[PDB]
């Protein structure tokens, strides 16, 4: 089930990495038995960092960034959205 997480930048930034496709759209993939267009995902979480402390986990699939739907998004679109805020990030994630 999707959930919303709020992350406040610390000195180590937010403390997580995102990996995913370069292109927009593409073949549907089932995540937890539900079909979605391709989703960028959390590929690493710094132990003790802001994302870790906020409950973000490696493998989390990213559905929204700062209230903007990023289903099927390009990597660049998701990077730019994560950096949109000066010190706060709100994610809608699906854990696997």
């Amino acid at each position: 089930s999707p959930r919303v997480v709020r992350i406040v930048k610390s000195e180590s930034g937010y403390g997580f990495n995102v990996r995913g496709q370069v292109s927009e759209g593409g073949q549907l993939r089932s995540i937890n038995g539900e079909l979605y267009a391709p989703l960028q995902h959390v590929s690493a979480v710094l132990p003790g960092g802001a994302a870790d402390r906020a409950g973000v986990r490696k493998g989390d699939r990213i559905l929204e960034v700062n209230g903007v739907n990023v289903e099927g998004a390009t990597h660049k679109q998701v990077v730019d959205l994560i950096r949109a805020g000066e010190k706060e990030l709100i994610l809608t994630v699906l854990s696997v």
């Binding site: 990495n17 995102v18 994302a51 990077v79």
Partner: peptide, 6 residues
């Protein structure tokens, strides 16, 4: 696929 750090 591409990876970025935050």
């Amino acid at each position: 696929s591409l990876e970025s750090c935050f």
